[PDB]
Amino acid sequence: SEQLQRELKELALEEERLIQELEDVEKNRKVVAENLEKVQAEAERLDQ
C-alpha cells in the first residue's frame, strides 16, 4: 500500500521523462526540417 504509492510516484516520473524526451526529439526534428529547407532553397538558387 505504501510501496504501491511510492511505485505510482516513480512511474509518473518515468512517464514524464518519456514525454519530455519525445518533446525534445520533436524540437530536433523541427530544427532539422528548417535547416533542410534553407539548404534546399540555396541549392535551387545555385541550380539556376
Binding site: L11, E14, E15, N28, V32, L36, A43, L46
Partner: protein
Amino acid sequence: ELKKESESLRLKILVLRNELERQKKALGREVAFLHKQQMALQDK
C-alpha cells in the same frame, strides 16, 4: 484505485517508449539526409 492507476501508467509508458523509438528512427534518417544535402552543396 492504485492497481488501475499503476496499470494505466504502465500502458501509457509502453506506448510512449514505442513512439519515442519511432521518432528517434525518423530523426536519425532526417539528420543523415540533411547532412547529405549540406555536403552536396559543399561539394558542388
